[PDB]
Design a protein around this nucleic acid. Structure first.
Lengths: 50, 1273
RNA sequence: UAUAUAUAUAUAUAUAUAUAUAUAUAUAUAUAUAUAUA
RNA sequence: UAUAUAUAUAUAUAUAUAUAUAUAUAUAUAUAUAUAUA
């Protein structure tokens, strides 16, 4: 009955998922802070700015 | 099994016989029957002590909460009503009360009691209210207990006896032993627990005992009290226990039924509570089966032939099931569960649903499950006070949503008004339809034929009747002195009696009497309110003739009466099967109360006007049925009024409309209530018998047709629905009978209609019916309900609950019957268990036990002697019950389809032949001179030793006493006769015809010396038959009873050693069975639920032959030569005589005399006589000439082709040449084929080819003797 | 001792059904707020 | 005070998704019992 039901009705969906939409940014590479910058508060004040 | 040890010795022997251990014998047959009649019934309950139950059932003490009866009854307007407890006005049934306080003690049995003589006296004499209320309550409560074919305890005893020992296996490879076992049945355990309350010293006092005059009750001690509902609960439990065993259901389902009954019994009004939640089981199971994903299986492929009017169907293979074909309608779980929540029985639904989910695919198991669960509904014949019934049913009037405005009518025509042409709508459609039919009836020389006139007058007389008192009063009122014939001992209320009084009178003198009271009656039902019987008087029945005639024409000439020809009821079987197939969508409809909704203000006025106008085309001066034309005033023109003549038909309408407008005036005289007769009118149509089906079916068809073709397309919204709704017509899409109707949709192309459109369609139909006040009560569940038959996916489902094993209707306070009648009850009881497919082996065992108890009985003179008798068991074999085990054979080799009568005997002997002959030779000395069929071995003495002859002749004896004549009463007999003949022979031509025919006949029969004393059917004897029927309807005097017992005993004791001449000759034939025939259908496909490999024999018989009656060339002999006949005479006697004459080669004038003897004119007599020929006659048509008929049990099988080309009467390579029939084969071969197929159907297992192998005498000798016997009779 | 068949139990996988929880949508009811009318 | 509209919260019903539990069917593995063969 499974095969017969399968062969008789084609409205079983199972279609490939074609429509996929993105509203974000078309990029695949991320700029990454690997090593954080140090916070200076006693000496060398002003050399870095956040 | 210690229970087997508990049984007394004779019953132990009987149980062994039923189990197949030993061949049954008259000796043990009597010992068991005798001892049952002497021991107290309570011992049957005592047997229950020896069953170690292990079921999870608890009987709450809530049962013993008797509600006081005094508040459940009252009298107002001098009638005892029911005053329902709940606000629901329908709680009019027997309450739950303790009957105890109303009991005295009996002198015979001091323990049990009956009503106080003081109470009934005061209610009778003083008309005291409380006395009357108590009496009414006692009467109905007793009556409800009496609704059983016999005492339930006896049935319980039967069940224990058969279930006390497992049956011995046969040698058959399909003989599965029973899977179910005792100690697991919730019903029996429930009976045990509840009965524990009714013991004082281990005595088990029965709560009640049924008697011929009703039922008695046991006086409770001061501590206890007996509620009447308990007795009802026991009956339901016993009935369920029996049914569950026979249907072989799982204990879980039986558990649910027990809880079902217990919950109902706990609350007040046990009947009402059951009635409310009636349809729960079918809705849970039948209405919702395949609403899932894993659907599949095999289904029948049925095709409806092109001339659909003929209702011819063809089996044409099988269809694979798949998900696209699964049912579309919503399930029924939600409403049912919601209802069950009210009675806190949701567990039952959960259990049922969970169990149902185990059958996703359609097969034998699924339908078997459906059959079993649907068998759980209560099988009790509910009864209520007739006064409440009549007050509750006829108090309804239809509500019309758009009445015909008064300005829509013309001026009066004396009584009727014609309908203005400008008016449209369904009413216009109805008006035109009836008018057109009236026109066709108007000119029709079919009437005024004196023979046809005789048919109509004769149709009005039956043994029953009513309203005679009203008749005598009304005519005496108008100065008409009717005759009397009391000395002729016949009931006055019989329709025959009143008819005789009328015979002489000029008809028009009687016209004033039609406006007279009509008595009424009530017949109880199993699953609904009781039905009504409203017999009109003969005069009223005569006046309403035009209404019937037009209705008949509408039916027979539009949709061919939708099967209301009722020729064989089985034509609906293939119809519903086809209607339930996957490719088709079907909807079940039926008028809510067609009898109560047809009325004069809307319906009958339109019909009367149409008929009166429709009869205008015709001779204005033409009397009809003695009603002459008259002058009536026409007032259609306000400027030119006048008067003109109108034909008799119109005069009938004039009075008929007057009567309908006045409304029927009934008079109730219920006996169960006390001194409360009264009369009140109503618009409710009589609808007491099939004579009403014609009118309602006609109107049913008309409204449906207008809805389909006009109203629906103009009103529906879905374009797709419009597309499919069009191209649809009633003649090929709708059938009906009375209120019931079936609507089936055109095959949606490889698809199914949206449930959305269905809802739209069904909704509009409801509104359409609401317009003119018809509640259509439609439903859509992809099943077939028509005339109480159920089909699911082309498989028939026997609703066994509608045939309760223990229940039987009784409409009077007294059973009013004599002991021998019980036998016929047993026979009818057994057949239902065959029609419905039960476990054929176990059902047979139970049947014999029932027979054994019934086999014995007695009677006592009103003052004098007692009398007694009992039958040898072989009687029941002749009556149509297969034997379980013969000496020398193996048990359970005879199928239930074994034919009754001589055929069954012959088949049994034919199989039993060789063993008997050989055994007789060893045991007994040879007889003194050679025998035709036997050798010298003398088996007849052996048969007498088995008492076969005793049983064979005992079954032939009559079972109802005969009333005695008298000579002055014979002057009334002559007076009765004369008048009946006078009523029959209104004209003179018929009398001349019959007299000439009779005179010629006896002259020919004697002179030609065919024979003398031939009782040939003739009209002169029809009044004699009526008189005998009328006298028979009376309660016989005791002397007749004494004659019966004495005659029966003498017939038993008389030593005879011969069967009937026919059976003697039939034994000369030797028949053998070959291989199995080719199969009809795939064994996988189920066709009848329960006819499965488990229930092998039914499964074999159906599979081999196929169910669908498909006589493509046989027509089963329905083409009788005499289409038109008068009542009283038998067509089956007439054609038998005619064929017998034709075989005897009588001269043509013999046929002429016989035909003229039943009113046929000479010209048509010659025309009919010429048609008689051995060629065109059918196998059954010619075989019936020697009373070889088809058993009713076969009517559901396609036996035609088998009898045609599978029962070889002469196979060249097998038959001995001595058996060659030669030229007489033209009429010999059908007889042999009938004998062959009867033997083949007798044995169990698959159907095999049947072959005549030898006739001991030459076939010529057999034919010669047959011709002699044919000439003799 | 091994092989084969049948039955029962347990484990794992897959499918179907039911129940419960959570999320989202829609409908209905109740409460609160705001607006408008009386 | 009431009616109507809109928003928010809560409850109930229906649909869809996810998780968990239970039941049924099928497959595979293991154990036990019975039958047959060696």
């Amino acid at each position: 009955s499974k095969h017969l039901s399968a062969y008789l009705d084609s409205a079983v969906a199972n279609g490939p998922e074609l429509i996929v939409e993105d509203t974000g940014l078309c990029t695949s590479f991320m700029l990454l802070d690997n090593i954080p910058s140090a916070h200076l508060t006693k000496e060398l004040i002003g050399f870095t700015w956040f | 099994e210690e229970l087997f040890n508990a049984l007394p010795q004779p019953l132990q022997q009987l149980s062994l016989a039923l189990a197949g251990e030993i061949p049954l014998t008259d000796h043990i047959f009597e010992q068991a029957a005798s001892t049952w009649h002497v021991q107290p019934r309570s011992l049957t309950y005592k047997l229950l002590d020896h069953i170690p139950f292990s079921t999870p059932v608890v009987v709450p003490p809530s049962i013993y909460h008797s509600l006081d009866w005094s508040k459940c009854f009252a009298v107002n307007q001098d009638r005892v009503e029911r005053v329902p407890t709940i606000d629901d006005p329908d709680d009019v049934y027997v309450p739950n009360s303790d009957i105890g306080p109303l009991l005295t003690s009996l002198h015979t049995i001091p323990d049990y009691g009956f009503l106080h003589p003081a109470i009934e006296n005061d209610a009778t004499t003083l008309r005291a209210e409380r006395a009357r209320c108590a009496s009414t309550f006692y009467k109905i409560a007793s009556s409800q207990a009496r609704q059983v074919k016999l005492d339930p305890i006896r049935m319980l005893g039967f069940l224990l006896l058969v279930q006390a020992r497992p049956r011995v296996p046969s040698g058959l490879v399909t003989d599965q032993p029973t899977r179910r076992d005792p100690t697991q049945s919730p019903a029996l355990h429930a009976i045990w627990q509840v009965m524990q309350y009714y013991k004082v010293a281990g005595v088990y006092y029965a709560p009640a005992l049924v008697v011929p005059s009703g039922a008695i009750w046991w006086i409770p001690p001061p501590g206890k009290r007996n509620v009447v509902s308990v007795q009802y609960l026991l009956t339901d439990l016993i009935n369920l226990a029996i049914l569950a065993h026979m249907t072989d259901m799982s204990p879980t389902l039986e558990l649910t039924g027990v809880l079902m009954y217990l919950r109902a019994a706990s609350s007040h009004s046990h009947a009402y509570t059951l009635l409310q939640m009636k349809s729960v089981f079918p809705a849970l199971s039948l209405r919702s089966m395949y609403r899932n994903k894993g659907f599949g299986g095999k289904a029948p492929a049925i095709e409806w032939t092109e001339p659909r009017s003929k209702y011819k169907f063809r089996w044409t293979g099988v269809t694979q099931l798949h998900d696209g074909l699964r049912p579309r309608s919503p399930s029924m779980d939600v409403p049912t569960l919601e209802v069950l929540t009210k009675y806190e029985l949701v567990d039952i639904g959960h259990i049922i649903i969970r169990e149902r989910n185990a059958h996703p695919r359609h097969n034998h198991d699924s339908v078997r499950f459906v059959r079993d669960v649907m068998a759980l509904t209560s099988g009790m014949y509910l009864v209520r006070q007739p006064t409440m019934s009549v007050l509750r049913e006829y108090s309804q009037v239809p509500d019309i949503k758009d009445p015909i405005p008064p300005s829509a009518w013309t001026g009066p025509i004396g009584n009727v008004r014609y309908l203005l042409p400008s008016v449209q709508g369904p009413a216009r459609h109805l008006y035109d339809t009836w008018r057109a039919a009236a026109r066709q009836i108007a000119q029709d020389p079919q009437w005024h034929d004196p023979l046809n006139q005789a048919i109509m007058r004769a149709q009005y007389v039956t043994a029953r009747g009513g309203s005679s008192a009203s008749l005598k009063f009304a005519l005496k009122v108008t100065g008409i002195v009717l005759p009397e014939y009391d000395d002729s001992k016949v009931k006055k209320s019989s329709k025959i009696y009143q008819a005789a009084q009328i015979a002489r009178i000029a008809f028009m003198l009687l016209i004033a009497a039609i406006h007279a009271e009509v008595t009424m009656g009530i017949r109880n039902q199993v699953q609904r309110r009781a039905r009504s019987i409203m017999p009109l008087n003969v005069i009223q029945q005569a006046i309403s003739a035009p209404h019937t005639l037009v209705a008949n024409y509408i039916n027979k000439h539009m949709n061919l009466s939708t099967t209301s020809g009722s020729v064989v009821t089985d034509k609906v079987i293939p119809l519903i099967l086809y209607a339930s197939t996957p490719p088709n969508t079907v909807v079940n409809v039926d008028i809510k109360a067609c009898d109560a909704s047809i009325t004069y203000n809307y319906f009958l006025s339109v019909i009367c006007g149409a008929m009166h106008e429709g009869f205008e085309v015709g001779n204005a001066d033409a009397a009809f049925m003695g009603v002459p034309s008259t002058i009536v005033s026409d007032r259609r023109s306000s400027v030119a009024p006048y008067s003109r003549p109108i034909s008799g038909l119109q005069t009938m309408v004039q009075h008929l409309a007057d009567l309908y407008a006045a409304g029927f005036r009934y008079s109730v005289s219920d006996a169960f209530s006390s001194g409360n007769k009264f009369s009140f009118p109503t618009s409710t149509f009589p609808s007491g018998s099939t004579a009403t089906s014609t009118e309602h079916t006609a109107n049913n068809s008309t409204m449906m047709e207008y809805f389909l073709n006009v109203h629906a397309p103009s009103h529906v919204k879905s374009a797709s629905l419009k597309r499919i709704l069009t191209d649809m017509t009633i003649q090929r899409n709708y059938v009906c009978q009375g209120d019931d109707g079936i609507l089936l949709l055109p095959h949606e192309a490889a698809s199914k209609i949206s449930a959305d459109d269905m809802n739209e369609l069904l909704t509009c139909l409801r509104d359409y019916g609401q317009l003119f006040g018809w509640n259509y009560d439609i439903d859509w569940s992809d099943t077939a309900e028509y005339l109480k038959l159920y089909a699911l996916m082309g498989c028939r489902i026997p609703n066994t609950s509608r045939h309760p094993p223990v229940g039987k209707e009784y409409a009077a306070p007294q059973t009013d019957e004599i002991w021998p009648s019980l036998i016929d009850i047993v026979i009818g009881h057994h057949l239902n268990g065959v029609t419905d497919v039960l476990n054929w082996r176990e059902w047979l065992r139970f049947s014999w036990a029932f027979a054994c108890y019934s086999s014995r009985g007695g009677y006592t003179n009103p003052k004098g002697q007692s009398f007694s008798a009992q039958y040898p068991w072989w009687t029941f074999v002749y009556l149509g019950i297969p034997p379980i085990l013969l000496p020398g054979q193996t048990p359970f080799i005879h199928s239930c389809y074994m034919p009754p009568g001589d055929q069954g005997m012959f088949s049994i002997l034919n199989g039993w032949r060789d063993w008997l002959i050989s055994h007789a030779s060893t045991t007994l000395p040879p007889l003194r001179h050679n025998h035709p069929v036997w050798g010298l071995s003398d088996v007849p003495s052996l048969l007498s030793q088995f008492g076969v002859y005793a049983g064979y002749h005992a079954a032939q004896h009559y079972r109802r006493p005969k009333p005695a004549p008298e000579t002055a009463s014979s002057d009334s007999i002559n007076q009765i006769t004369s008048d009946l003949t006078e009523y029959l022979f209104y004209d003179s031509a018929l009398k001349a015809r019959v007299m000439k025919g009779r005179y010629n006949w006896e002259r020919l029969s004697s002179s030609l010396s065919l024979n003398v004393g031939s009782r040939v059917p003739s009209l002169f004897d029809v009044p004699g038959k009526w008189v005998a029927a009328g006298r028979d309807a009376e309660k016989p005097p005791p002397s007749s009873v004494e004659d019966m017992f004495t005659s029966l005993n003498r017939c038993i004791r008389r030593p005879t050693h011969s069967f009937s001449r026919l059976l003697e000759l039939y034994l000369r034939v030797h028949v053998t069975l070959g291989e199995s025939i080719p199969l009809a259908i795939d064994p996988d496909v189920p066709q009848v639920a329960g006819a499965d490999p488990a229930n092998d024999d039914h499964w074999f018989k159906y599979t081999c032959l196929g169910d669908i009656p498909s006589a493509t060339r046989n027509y089963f002999g329905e083409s009788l030569f005499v289409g038109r006949v008068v009542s009283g005479l038998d067509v089956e006697a007439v054609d038998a005589t005619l064929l017998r004459l034709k075989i005897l080669g009588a001269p043509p004038e013999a046929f002429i005399a016989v035909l003229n003897g039943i009113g046929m004119s000479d010209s048509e007599a010659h025309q009919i006589a010429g048609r008689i020929s051995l060629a065109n006659a059918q196998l059954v048509q010619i075989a019936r000439v020697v009373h070889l008929s088809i058993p009713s049990s076969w009517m559901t099988l396609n036996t035609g082709p088998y009898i045609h080309h599978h029962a070889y009467d002469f196979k060249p390579g097998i038959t001995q040449p001595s058996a060659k029939s030669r030229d007489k084969s033209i009429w010999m071969s059908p007889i042999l084929k009938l004998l062959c197929t009867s033997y083949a159907m007798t044995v169990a297992g698959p159907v095999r080819t049947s072959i005549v192998t030898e006739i001991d005498g030459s076939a010529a000798a057999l034919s010669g003797n047959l011709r002699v016997w044919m000439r003799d009779v």
